[PDB]
Amino acid sequence: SYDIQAWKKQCEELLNLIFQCEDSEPFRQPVDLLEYPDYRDIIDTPMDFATVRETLEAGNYESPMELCKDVRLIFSNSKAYTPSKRSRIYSMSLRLSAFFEEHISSVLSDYKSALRFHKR
Numbered sequence: 001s002y003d004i005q006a007w008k009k010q011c012e013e014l015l016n017l018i019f020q021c022e023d024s025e026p027f028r029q030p031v032d033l034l035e036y037p038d039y040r041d042i043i044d045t046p047m048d049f050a051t052v053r054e055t056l057e058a059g060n061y062e063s064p065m066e067l068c069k070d071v072r073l074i075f076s077n078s079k080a081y082t083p084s085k086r087s088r089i090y091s092m093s094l095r096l097s098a099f100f101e102e103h104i105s106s107v108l109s110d111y112k113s114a115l116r117f118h119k120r
């Protein structure tokens with residue numbers, strides 16, 4: 001399965017599944033500072049799933065590793081802001097992270113395998 005470009009549609013499909021998850025609601029658009037006025041005091045690099053989808057669709061990711069780094073930033077940012085491990089939004093972030101990691105694993109493996117085959 002040595003298609004170097006196949007990761008992009010696989011990531012579009014995975015983002016579609018993440019948007020269907022009720023657990024993605026809080027992460028679907030850039031955080032609003034009116035509700036959380038100190039957000040940029042704690043969070044240096046805001047990230048959300050709409051920004052990840054737009055970056056993919058603009059052709060501004062070179063690899064699925066770069067998309068994975070941005071999705072992981074959504075989850076680390078949510079953790080940086082949670083007042084507790086028992087908070088609702090943080091709890092939704094942990095389930096969504098587990099779902100994302102379960103699905104991205106093969107996308108990364110296939111891509112890296114395809115690049116190694118190209119350079120063989």
Ligand SMILES: CCCCNC(=O)N1CCN(C(=O)c2ccco2)C[C@@H]1C
Nearest residue numbers: 026027028031047048074077078081089
């Ligand atoms: C009662 C509050 C309503 C939900 N809002 C809320 O608590 N949020 C702050 C923390 N957060 C994030 O850090 C984050 C990462 C990616 C997108 O947002 C999620 C959400 C916007």
